[PDB]
Amino acid sequence: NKIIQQIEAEQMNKEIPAFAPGDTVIVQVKVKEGDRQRLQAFEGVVIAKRNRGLNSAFTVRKISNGVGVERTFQTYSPIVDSLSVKRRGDVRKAKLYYLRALSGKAARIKEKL
Amino acid sequence: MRHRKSGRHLSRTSAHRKAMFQNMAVSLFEHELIKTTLPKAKELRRVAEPLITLAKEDSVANRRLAFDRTRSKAAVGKLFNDLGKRYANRPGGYLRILKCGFRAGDNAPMAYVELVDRP
């Protein structure tokens, strides 16, 4: 797994800002709409983070048009063009799966400051 | 399967297994040489050797961590007053498993567990 680690470390050249679960992030997603490349922003709360080096992932939950959406992003995938934190959450947990049962004012994360 | 799994069931619940190996490690620290079955002696390494490693740094938090894992005041005192200082320069391997014969009652493979420096 020293051979594997070195292969993976080659493709982790992307610089990713530090974000924690509970953070509200904006993910710039590369979209190939036939011929026109563009960036579609996926804003939402990071409810889970999976740090496995190249195999890192994070899950962003948003309420879109009254329907909740959860996207699990592959952190080092080229599709994730950029990442930014709008605001930082103050949560006691690594995973925020309990947010799915909540909505509206009950699903508010305190800001970290 | 049990591919790449660690630990021995020893036909016990995990509560009883945890209680027994904490009893055995406490007994080993008191007497410095005990006789038990070879399977128990081999699994006692993974419980009693991290306790001696912890005892090398004497602090309130390490002593409390020792007491949570032993629940014995005498064992905690022996680990930090005698065994922690005795094995300060020893990089692990504080126990020695020596095979004796078999138990008379059930032909169970026996082992001697002794502390390395002096039993």
């Binding site: - | 020596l98 095979k99 014969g101 001697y112 002794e114």
Partner: protein
């Protein structure tokens, strides 16, 4: 489920052709000349020269 025919004494003893006991690996201490199990502490209490249990 049970036999329809009593098993013959030849057939009984043929199944037992795998029942023979094996001998243990026996070693001799050099400090004492004493016989012990290989890789085991000797009945007197010696292993590879030194006394370990001290009786």
């Amino acid at each position: 489920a049970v036999q329809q025919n009593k098993k013959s004494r030849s057939a009984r003893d043929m199944r037992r052709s795998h029942d023979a006991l094996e001998s243990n690996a026996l070693s001799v201490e050099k400090s004492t000349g004493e016989v012990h199990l290989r890789h085991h502490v000797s009945p007197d209490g010696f292993y590879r020269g030194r006394k370990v249990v001290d009786k």
